[PDB]
Structure formats: structure tokens, C-alpha cells
Write a protein that binds this ligand. Structure first.
Ligand code: HEM
Ligand SMILES: *[C@@H]1O[C@H](CO)[C@@H](O[C@@H]2O[C@H](CO)[C@@H](O)[C@H](O)[C@H]2NC(C)=O)[C@H](O)[C@H]1NC(C)=O
Ligand SMILES: *[C@@H]1O[C@H](CO)[C@@H](O)[C@H](O)[C@H]1NC(C)=O
Ligand SMILES: *[C@@H]1O[C@H](CO)[C@@H](O)[C@H](O)[C@H]1NC(C)=O
Ligand SMILES: *[C@@H]1O[C@H](CO)[C@@H](O)[C@H](O)[C@H]1NC(C)=O
Ligand SMILES: [Ca+2]
Length: 595
């Protein structure tokens, strides 16, 4: 009646509602509707898609087609006129560590991923955009505006391919196009363990019966483990230094080597699983491999949940934390736990938190080596700088002692991302993440800024002066009106990120509402939430309350000096303490069974 009843994923999945553990795919979390929150299904629509033709074609696709009577601006022009800035001085966050930015990317990768269509590049399909910039089908290139420097140096466009959609692949009709979420919507450490059975098994050490995750066999970090290499060619991590020839890492998530501090974070997370699996073997020598894997996995998922909801979200949402995410009251099976399409743009706020450089620091937290600080763009797809140039310990100290970029209406996105982004199969450090984000909003059929203001119960500015009051910025509002002609047409990514930040937070009201709702739903709609009665024992839960990121670092590096509050801006040695000061995770309550 209402829909075509589309069933894209393998419709066949057996549940076994006895099981104490999550599935890898996210299936069977919800008993009534077992596909809810599972990978490889459509992103949720909180509002109906808005396409130029009602169905599929992004706004901007057809030159003569207006949105509400006006042409949508070129995404790269928006980027150049609004998002870009020259001066990196004065741009850092005096009260957020670089680790704050990094955790955000980690959580994001746990929750959502809308891969571009035709997930493996075949033949010369992509001579369309890359070579000749011809818009057609899934080819939706980002065209340069006149007077853009990149015109002189790089050609007429940046290539951009449309995101994958559910029912068919290249064709579709009789319904609006719905993009795919290829990972589980639950905050479940899927970035570590995988979202498909297949990857999930390849990541494991099945050779031993200790419940370990596979580790690198070709390299070590003062004996501490690295992730296995992904030996798929062609490797971007190889392409960026064919002399080192150090390939990308293989992780539960495809994007783990996009930048060195993300690869770093994934490495910490792997070690913690192996560490937990060893402690569980000691206490329970009678537990088999499978038991040890699941129980470690379960602890690790709880860890990410706690860090996120107890430490991270409060200092993102600030004053609005309590409004959108009140204290836990138990699993509710009527709550939809699926990630919305809009959320996958709202969480891009992190793009304005990425600074232009990364530092390696020694044990006195001083520059590590002559080239301790590096431009961010030299670190995309960069594994060799880990394997061959100090392991993760120096980078982790940088995450603690260096600062995030602060979002700034006059300095939104560093040119390292806005001009120097590298993407696989594109060969150059010359893309623009901002422009991509805006093109993707259109690709995904996003409602515009005032639709979402309306959704969130917020005023909907119609005039320049209305917009000035909401943004509390006259020039920004003017540039936005010059480009969009109406606030109704402002892309959600830029509109949302334009708004001044809420007290004690790092996003504005609109984003706090959109993020706040999504996270509430992730928690309340999850049958395996760590605090749901039955998931963990009383005593297990008492031990998990004492997890911290500080302690993750101590147990999984050879770092012995850490802050107590790692997401804060911390200066060494004053704000730093010895590792012995810090609570450990007490695994006693996982002792087989009591006397
Ligand atoms: C150097 C750091 C980072 C790089 C290089 C980076 C790069 C990227 C790229 C290339 C995409 C895909 C763009 C597209 O095709 O539409 C992306 C998407 C995204 N990024 Fe970032 N990003 C970074 C940091 C962050 C941070 C700090 C956050 C959040 C706090 C974040 C959240 C997201 C999200 C949610 C997506 C959409 C994922 C999806 O559902 O497909 N990123 N990022
Ligand atoms: C590619 O990686 C190599 C190392 O794998 C980098 O060079 C090493 O780095 C410096 C170069 O001055 C020295 O320690 C060694 O002489 C280099 N080793 C080798 C094998 O040459 C090199 O700079 C990297 N290139 C890029 C562009 O990243
Ligand atoms: C810095 O951030 C934390 C939030 O976690 C807050 O408790 C602390 O008071 C802040 N410092 C400032 C800006 O006063
Ligand atoms: C798996 O387990 C054994 C014992 O710890 C170890 O020696 C072996 O190298 C591991 N295999 C991989 C690839 O992680
Ligand atoms: C559960 O969640 C929905 C929100 O989607 C709410 O309307 C409903 O009252 C809740 N019911 C329970 C069981 O608390
Ligand atoms: Ca997940």
C-alpha cells in the first residue's frame, strides 16, 4: 500500500533471540522488526527527500530548474566565498584537545557510511568525470566557478560520484531514491569488528583459540601490535609513497587509514580487544575462542558507548545535552535506532574542528625529531609514518597535548581539507571536502535549512536581517543571501555549521537538536545498550563505570603520563599525571561464575 516493500539486503537472516551477543550485521537487535539498525539498508528519512524531480535528481542537476524560484549556487563557490580562510593563527580551541576531533570521527565511522555507487571501480567507467567532466548518471562533478585558482591548475571540475541507493543500483523509479548505510546504526564497535560476516571473520585470529583479532605479522610497535595490512591493490597508502610501499590497514571499517590519527585510534582499539581477550583467558581458561572474542567485543562496545555518552556528547551538546538526551531509563523497543540521512551531514561539523597540522611528541612531550610537526595533507592515507617513523605513541601524545581547531564563522575549514584533500583513484592532493559535503547534501536529497529549523522548532529566517539575527553575523548572512537568495535554499551542512555554538558546546541550536535526537535514539533503541538491565551484571556495570580514555592509552601504549580529562585542552606537565593515578577496568566480575 504505502511502499514497494523493498528488500535490498539478503532477506534471509536467522535471529536466535536466545543469543547474549550482538550480530555483526546489526540484525536481530529489535525483535519486532529485526532489520532495524542493520547495515546495508536505507538511511532513515526524518523528512521526505527533496529532489529536483521529486524522485532522484539532485538540486543543481539541471541548469534551468530552480529551487523555490532561484538557482542553487555551485558548491565550490560556496566553499571559496564562505568556507575558506588563509590565516591559521588564532584558530585553535583553547578548551578542546585534538583527541576531541578524533573521537568524533571514530564515533561517526561506527554509525554511518554511504559509499559511492559501483563500490569496485571496473574498466574505464570513470573516464566520464575524471577526464572530461561530463555530468551523467552517477557522475555529478563539482564544477569550478570562474576566477577559481584550481581552474588554472587542475581542469574544469573535481570528480564526484553519487552515493549508492537501495532497491536497484543505476536504475530506479516509482519512489524517492534512498542512500545506503553500510555499517550498523548501533554504537557497537563495528568500526573494529566489521559490519559484514565476511570481513568480521577475516579480521579474526582463528588460528589460535584465544579469541584474538588478527595482528600485523610484518611490523611491531616496541612489541605492541599493529593492524594487519590490507593487501588489496591498488593501495592509496602505497600510492602516496611508492618508495616506502607501506599499504593501508585492514580494519572493521573501510576508512581506517584516511588519516594517520584515525589509524592511530583504530590501533588503540584493536590492542584493547586483544588485551581484554588475554585477561578473560586467564580468569576463564575454560572459555573457548568464540566466547573470548564475543566477551571482549562486548566490553569494547560498552567502552565506546560510555566514552561517547559520558565524556564526548556533553561537551558537544553543552546546555542542550539534558534537553535531548535525559538520563537513561531503559531499552524502548518502539524507538527507531536507524541513522537518519540528515545526521550523516549534521555530524560533519567535525570538518571545522580539524587543524592544519599534526605533531609527534616524545616522553617529555617536546617535539619528537626535526620534522615533529607536519601539514595535515601529507598525512592522508599515510601508514608508513606510523610503521617506519615512531609507531603510535608519539602521535597519541600529540592528540593529548595539541588542540582541535575551533569552529569560526570567518575561518570554517582549513585549506588542508578544502584545497589539498586526497581521494583514492584521483592521484592528487587537490580536492575540497567542503564542496564535496555540499554536493553530497544535494546528492542525498536533503531538505534545506528552514525545513530543518522547522523540524527542530526553531525560527525560520526569511530575510537577510532575519538571517543576521539567527547567525549573529551580518557579513556571513549577507554572503549566504548573495549566494542562496533565500535561507530556505541554504544547504543543511553550511546552514547548520554557520550558527553560533550553544553554551558549553561546539555546535549551534539546529545541530544540537539534530545530533541530540539521533544519539537519544541510538541509545534508547538499542537492546544491547551497556546499561540495559540484563546486558551486563550489576558488578560488571560497576567496573565499566570506571573506564576512561586516559586508561585506554596507559594499557595499550608505553605512555605513563596522561590527563584525567583527555578531551579538555591539556598542557604538560601541569595537567598531566602518572598512569598509576588512573582507575583501571576491573575484570573480576567476569570470573566464569562465583562460589
Ligand atoms: C582529517 C580528518 C578528516 C577527514 C580527512 C575527513 C574526510 C571525509 C571524507 C572524504 C568524507 C566523505 C565525503 C563524501 O564523499 O561525501 C567524510 C565524510 C564524513 N565525515 Fe569526515 N573527515 C575528517 C574528520 C571528521 C570528523 C572529525 C568528523 C566528525 C566529528 C567527521 C565526520 C564525517 C561524517 C559523518 C561523514 C559522512 C559519513 C557517511 O555517512 O558517509 N569527519 N569525511
Ligand atoms: C617515502 O618514505 C621514505 C621512507 O620509507 C622517506 O625517506 C626516508 O625518510 C628520510 C628521507 O630524507 C630518510 O630517513 C631516509 O633516507 C628515507 N628512506 C629511504 C628508503 O629513502 C621519503 O621521504 C618518503 N617520501 C615521501 C614523499 O613521503
Ligand atoms: C573547559 O571545558 C570543560 C568542559 O568539559 C569545563 O568543565 C571547563 O570549565 C572549561 N573551561 C573553561 C572554558 O572555563
Ligand atoms: C594468532 O595467535 C598466535 C598466538 O598468539 C600468534 O602467534 C599468531 O601470530 C596470531 N596470528 C595473527 C595473524 O594474528
Ligand atoms: C518509547 O519511545 C517512543 C518514542 O519513539 C515514545 O513515544 C513512547 O512513549 C515510549 N514508550 C515506552 C515504552 O516508554
Ligand atoms: Ca555501528
Amino acid at each position: 500500500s504505502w511502499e514497494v516493500g523493498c528488500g535490498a539486503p539478503v532477506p534471509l537472516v536467522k535471529c536466535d533471540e536466545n543469543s547474549p551477543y550482538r550480530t555483526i550485521t546489526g540484525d536481530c537487535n529489535n525483535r519486532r522488526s529485526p532489520a532495524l539498525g542493520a547495515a546495508n539498508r536505507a538511511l532513515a528519512r526524518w523528512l521526505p527527500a527533496e529532489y529536483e524531480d521529486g524522485l532522484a535528481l539532485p538540486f543543481g542537476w539541471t541548469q534551468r530548474k530552480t529551487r523555490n524560484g532561484f538557482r542553487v549556487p555551485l558548491a565550490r563557490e560556496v566553499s571559496n566565498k564562505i568556507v575558506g580562510y588563509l590565516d591559521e593563527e588564532g584558530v585553535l580551541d583553547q578548551n578542546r584537545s585534538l583527541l576531541f576531533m578524533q573521537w568524533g570521527q571514530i564515533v561517526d565511522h561506527d554509525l554511518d557510511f554511504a559509499p559511492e555507487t559501483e563500490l569496485g571501480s571496473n574498466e574505464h567507467s570513470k573516464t566520464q568525470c575524471e577526464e572530461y567532466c561530463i555530468q551523467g548518471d552517477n557522475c555529478f562533478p563539482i564544477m569550478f566557478p570562474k576566477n577559481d585558482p584550481k581552474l588554472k591548475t587542475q581542469g574544469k571540475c573535481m570528480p564526484f560520484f553519487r552515493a549508492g541507493f537501495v532497491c536497484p543500483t543505476p536504475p530506479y523509479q516509482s519512489l524517492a531514491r534512498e542512500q545506503i548505510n553500510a555499517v550498523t546504526s548501533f554504537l557497537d564497535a563495528s568500526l573494529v569488528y566489521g559490519s559484514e560476516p565476511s570481513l568480521a571473520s577475516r579480521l579474526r585470529n582463528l588460528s589460535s583459540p584465544l579469541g584474538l583479532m588478527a595482528v600485523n605479522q610484518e611490523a611491531w610497535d616496541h612489541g605492541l601490535a599493529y593492524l594487519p595490512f590490507n593487501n588489496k591493490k591498488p593501495s592509496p597508502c602505497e600510492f602516496i609513497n611508492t618508495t616506502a610501499r607501506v599499504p593501508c590497514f585492514l580494519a572493521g571499517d573501510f576508512r581506517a587509514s584516511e588519516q594517520i590519527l584515525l589509524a592511530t585510534a583504530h590501533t588503540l582499539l584493536l590492542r584493547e580487544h586483544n588485551r581484554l581477550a588475554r585477561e578473560l583467558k586467564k580468569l576463564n581458561p575454560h572459555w573457548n575462542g568464540e566466547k573470548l572474542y564475543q566477551e571482549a567485543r562486548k566490553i569494547l562496545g560498552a567502552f565506546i558507548q560510555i566514552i561517547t555518552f559520558r565524556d564526548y556528547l556533553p561537551i558537544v551538546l553543552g546546555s542542550e545535552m539534558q534537553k535531548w538526551i535525559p538520563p537513561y531509563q531503559g531499552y524502548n523497543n518502539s524507538v527507531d535506532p536507524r541513522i537518519s540521512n540528515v545526521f550523516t551531514f549534521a555530524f560533519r561539523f567535525g570538518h571545522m574542528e580539524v587543524p592544519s597540522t599534526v605533531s609527534r611528541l616524545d616522553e617529555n612531550y617536546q617535539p619528537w625529531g626535526p620534522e615533529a610537526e607536519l601539514p595535515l595533507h601529507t598525512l592522508f592515507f599515510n601508514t608508513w609514518r606510523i610503521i617506519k617513523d615512531g609507531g603510535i605513541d608519539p602521535l597519541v601524545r600529540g592528540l593529548l597535548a595539541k588542540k582541535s581547531k575551533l569552529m569560526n564563522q570567518d575561518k570554517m575549514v582549513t585549506s588542508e581539507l578544502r584545497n589539498k584533500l586526497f581521494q583514492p583513484t584521483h592521484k592528487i592532493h587537490g580536492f575540497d571536502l567542503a564542496a564535496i559535503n555540499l554536493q553530497r547534501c544535494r546528492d542525498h536529497g536533503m531538505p534545506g535549512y528552514n525545513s530543518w529549523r522547522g523540524f527542530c522548532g526553531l525560527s525560520q529566517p526569511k530575510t537577510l536581517k532575519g538571517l543576521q539575527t539567527v547567525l549573529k553575523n551580518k557579513i556571513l548572512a549577507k554572503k549566504l543571501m548573495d549566494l542562496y537568495k533565500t535561507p530556505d535554499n541554504i544547504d543543511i551542512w553550511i546552514g547548520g555549521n554557520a550558527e553560533p555554538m550553544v553554551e558549553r558546546g561546539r555546535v549551534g541550536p539546529l545541530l544540537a537538536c539534530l545530533l541530540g535526537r539521533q544519539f537519544q535514539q541510538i541509545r534508547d533503541g538499542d537492546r544491547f545498550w551497556w546499561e540495559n538491565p540484563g546486558v551486563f551484571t550489576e558488578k560488571q556495570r560497576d567496573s565499566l563505570q570506571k573506564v576512561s580514555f586516559s586508561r585506554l592509552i596507559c594499557d595499550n601504549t608505553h605512555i605513563t603520563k596522561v590527563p584525567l580529562h583527555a578531551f579538555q585542552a591539556n598542557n604538560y606537565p601541569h595537567d598531566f599525571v602518572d598512569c598509576s593515578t588512573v582507575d583501571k577496568l576491573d575484570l573480576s566480575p567476569w570470573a566464569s561464575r562465583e562460589n
